[PDB]
Amino acid sequence: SKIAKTAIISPKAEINKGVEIGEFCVIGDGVKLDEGVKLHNNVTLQGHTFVGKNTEIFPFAVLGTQPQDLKYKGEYSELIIGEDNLIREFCMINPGTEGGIKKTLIGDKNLLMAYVHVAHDCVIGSHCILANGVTLAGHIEIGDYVNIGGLTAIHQFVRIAKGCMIAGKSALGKDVPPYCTVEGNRAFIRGLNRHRMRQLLESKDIDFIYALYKRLFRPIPSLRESAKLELEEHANNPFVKEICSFILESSRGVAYKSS
Amino acid sequence: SKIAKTAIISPKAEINKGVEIGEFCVIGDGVKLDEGVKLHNNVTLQGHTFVGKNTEIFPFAVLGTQPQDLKYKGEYSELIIGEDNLIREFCMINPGTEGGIKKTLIGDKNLLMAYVHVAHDCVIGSHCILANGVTLAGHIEIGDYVNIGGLTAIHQFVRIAKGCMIAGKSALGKDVPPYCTVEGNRAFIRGLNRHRMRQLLESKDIDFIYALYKRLFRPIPSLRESAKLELEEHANNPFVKEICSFILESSRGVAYKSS
Amino acid sequence: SKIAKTAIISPKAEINKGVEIGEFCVIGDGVKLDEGVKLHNNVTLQGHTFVGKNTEIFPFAVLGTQPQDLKYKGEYSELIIGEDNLIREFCMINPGTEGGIKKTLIGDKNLLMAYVHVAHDCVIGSHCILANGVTLAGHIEIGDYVNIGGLTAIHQFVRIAKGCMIAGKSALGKDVPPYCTVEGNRAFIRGLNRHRMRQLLESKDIDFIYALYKRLFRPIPSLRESAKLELEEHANNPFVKEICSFILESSRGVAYKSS
Ligand SMILES: CCCCCCCCS[C@@H]1O[C@H](CO)[C@@H](O)[C@H](O)[C@H]1O
Ligand SMILES: CCCCCCCCS[C@@H]1O[C@H](CO)[C@@H](O)[C@H](O)[C@H]1O
Ligand SMILES: CCCCCCCCS[C@@H]1O[C@H](CO)[C@@H](O)[C@H](O)[C@H]1O
């Protein structure tokens, strides 16, 4: 519950109770820090940025500066961060753009290791882990319980569904359906995130999913056609709905499988 | 037109009119900031560094500290940056060395995204874009209108000519002739930067270039011999001169083509 | 021998004579700086960190903050750095954990270039060079005279013996025996670090080592069996002892060779 005297804090910023601010932090006039937020020394918060309860941010992280994108034109956008997040040293996160969704959103209980960059208009859920140097291009969507290995680059508009695991040093240019593990320069699906499914899903449903994907990724009928048929033959099945609707909504297309 | 009171500025530094300096900037005694320069909070400028008109530098960038090279011995070198540049967060740029060209030079209207490192003795032109984490080794030369994708590493003494495009995550160890696109770990030429040529060149000349490269990269006569012959059969043709003289001057050799 | 007035230094920290501290440095209550240490502006030193004589640390480096590892629980660990080290901009080094060796150790005369991250429980020797962006996972052991190229990632528990060279952009998941050169995504041994051996070893011994490895890496008898036999047929030979005992102690296994 201490605010360093050396910290520069705009009188227009809103700092709730219990907030800790380390030495030399720089806080702009559009920042909001909810209860229990802890900023180590030298954190830079600019733009219209909201930082949720109990989130902790380490030294030299930069949040809220304008997107790097050239299309940006001093637009009115926001950066919204959830609760119980851990944001490490040298992270750089920008707010959204008018051409995107006018915001960059991050949920709860996530860990963004050092040197992680989150570009404008990205959406990250909860319980995610982005390792050292992960680089997210613009307009990316990441579901809950997603792990992305260090030094991985995700291209613009890519969508990663819930429970996915992406190996380090990968370059992902396509969407990844729920509970899949990805790896490779031009990343592709190598199987299912068994370890994740085992903690969130029941055995019976895990088997169903394997079967589902095996049928979905058959070569003959296109993925799209198999997905639509899957929704018909199983109008009542949460997993089919979650997986198939994700697939049919894909813009960049779904990543390569193995069959 | 405001200079933060918390900023540390050597009385020997030269700060022109209209310069903006954010909170906690550290400016050494050999720095010069031309008109309209904007430094966000926490920018570090050391050594004999000149920053051109209207250039803007974001938080935690470090410019002017001594090169990492071991051969360096407290030499007298400079870092010269042009006008209208955008230098993002966490960039690190060093001045030259006595063994090199005694300076690191950057032209105008360039964008160096976050975590970009420019080593000693590098030369960057104008209208260039270096994405997140691009790493330039020493003595590199980059022409105008060059785009280098994120997380790409360029090895020492490599030269990239005008209008080239280098895909992200590449490792370039050879020179790249004008208007070529490169990609791959041990990077190679995959074709021409059509999108770039279309905005700078006329259709007729674009066709000529394709033809030129097709003949230059034939397997039998060496690239060098074809280049010399090309200069003979076309003593009067700017494109041939620009492309062939570049090739004949190569030290590390020209990158692999595809034919 | 000057300490910037703007620097924040805990009265509990121990600062020896001749120490230089730049503007805005942040020094916690468990830090110790031995004689001749030079901190540029904005260096952050936290936790129970010791910095040896004459070590120099550049702007925005962060040393001593808690490990990123989730298993960590406000444990009592240390970060110990040796003498004559050069630690560049944006480096991030964490102390050890209770599950590891309760410390992160770095020897003497090393150069850690910019953006280098050293995870909890790592052990680095002396005369080493880690290029831009090298990322070390936890519990890694690096011997003396090791060079690791830029943007290389070393996985947890990997051990690199004395005199090894690791090419840039590699991903190492296995141990590397003394005097070997490694390269590749899933890194493997490509030969010997001749350049290194030539400065530290006599010609006769260099020949012996080549022969040793040629016999060790034969396909039929396992590496382990050949190593044990090598120790028997040469109970008195420092090189055999150094190389073979390293191999037999491997946890993650030894890297792939080429024969
Ligand atoms: C397969 C083709 C993939 C093309 C991907 C293009 C991504 C460009 S986006 C770019 O990403 C940066 C991440 O560092 C952000 O900082 C910028 O603001 C944003 O504009
Ligand atoms: C194919 C072989 C390629 C060899 C390339 C060697 C590059 C070493 S240079 C080195 O690059 C660093 C970039 O981070 C700079 O900081 C250092 O000052 C500079 O000395
Ligand atoms: C072949 C399989 C290799 C698995 C390697 C797993 C490494 C996870 S460790 C992890 O490394 C980070 C480096 O950035 C540190 O910051 C964290 O504290 C530490 O917990």
**What are the structure tokens assigned to C207, written together?**
């020949």
Beta carbon pairs, A and C, within 8 Å: 58
Q: Given the CA of residue B173, which atom of ligand 2 is nearest to it?
A: 1
Characterise C90 by phi-psi region: left (phi > 0), alpha (psi -120 to 50), beta (else).
left
Q: Can you state the angle between helices C223-233 and C203-216, rounded to 10 degrees?
A: 140
Among A26, A90, A120, A169, which would you mutate to test the B interface (most chain B Cβ atoms within 10 Å of its Cβ)? A26
What distance in Å separates the CA atoms of residue C179 and residue C184, rounded to the nearest whole number? 17
- What SS3 state is found at B141? strand
Q: Which of A40, A113, A168 sits opposite C68 (nearest CB)?
A: A113
What distance in Å separates the CA atoms of residue B82 and residue B85, rounded to the nearest whole number? 7
Give the N- to C-terminal CA distance of chain C in Å, as an integer.
56
- What SS3 state is found at C51? strand
- Domains recognised in chain A with CATH numbers: 1-192 (2.160.10.10), 193-259 (1.20.1180.10)
* C positions 93-112 inside 8 Å of B (CB): 111
What distance in Å separates the CA atoms of residue A232 and residue A212, rounded to the nearest whole number? 13
Using a 6 Å cutoff on CB, does residue A138 contact ligand 1? yes
* Residue C256 DSSP symbol: P
Per-residue CA distances from C12 to C31, C72, C76, C81 (Å): 8, 25, 17, 19
* Residue B65 DSSP symbol: P
Sheet containing strand C48-51, edge to edge, reads C14-15, C32-33, C48-51, C78-81, C103-106, C123-124, C141-142, C159-160
Chain B CB within 8 Å of residue A153 CB: yes
What distance in Å separates the CA atoms of residue A128 and residue B198, rounded to the nearest whole number? 43
What distance in Å separates the CA atoms of residue B146 and residue B140, rounded to the nearest whole number? 13
Characterise A144 by phi-psi region: left (phi > 0), alpha (psi -120 to 50), beta (else).
beta
The approach used to solve this structure was: X-ray
Ligand having the closest approach to the CA of C114: 2
Chain B CB within 8 Å of residue A133 CB: yes
CB-count exposure of residue B228 (10 Å: 0-12, 13-18, 19+): middle
- Please list the residues that pair with B111 across neighbouring strands: B86, B129
Task: Give φ, ψ of A94 to 5 degrees.
Answer: -105, 155
Does residue A77 contact residue A102 with C-beta atoms inside 8 Å? yes
Question: What residues in C contact A40, CB-CB < 8 Å?
Answer: 65
Q: Which residue of A has its CA nearest to B25?
A: A24
User: At how many Å resolution was this determined?
Assistant: 2.1
Chain A CB within 8 Å of residue C73 CB: no
User: Three-class SS string for C81-142?
Assistant: ECCCCEECCCCEECCCCCCCCCEEEECCCCEECCCCEECCCCEECCCCEECCCCEECCCCEE
What distance in Å separates the CA atoms of residue C241 and residue A123, rounded to the nearest whole number? 54
Ligand having the closest approach to the CA of A72: 1
Using a 6 Å cutoff on CB, does residue C67 contact ligand 3? yes
Question: What residues in A contact C132, CB-CB < 8 Å?
Answer: none
Helix (H) or strand (E) holding C225: helix C223-233
Helix (H) or strand (E) holding B228: helix B223-233
Helix (H) or strand (E) holding A79: strand A78-81
Chain C CB within 8 Å of residue A169 CB: yes
Pairing of strands C14-15, B48-51: unpaired
Does residue C116 contact residue C147 with C-beta atoms inside 8 Å? no
Whose CA is closest to C130, among C114, C115, C148, C145? C148
CA C225 to chain centroid: 29
Does residue C179 contact residue C209 with C-beta atoms inside 8 Å? yes
Count of helix runs (H) and strand runs (E) in chain B? 4, 27
Give the N- to C-terminal CA distance of chain B in Å, as an integer.
56
Residue C193 CB: number of other CB atoms within 10 A? 22
Does residue A48 contact residue A79 with C-beta atoms inside 8 Å? yes
Does residue B128 contact residue B108 with C-beta atoms inside 8 Å? no
Question: What residues in C contact B65, CB-CB < 8 Å?
Answer: 40, 58-59, 89
Per-residue CA distances from B213 to B145, B201, B237 (Å): 19, 16, 14
Whose CA is closest to B92, among A65, C86, C115, C149? C115
Sign of CA dihedral C41, C44, C48, C50: negative
Task: Give φ, ψ of A93 to 5 degrees.
Answer: -130, 125
The residues of B carrying an active-site annotation are: 120-121, 138
Residue C233 corresponds to which amino acid?
Answer: E
- What SS3 state is found at A45? strand
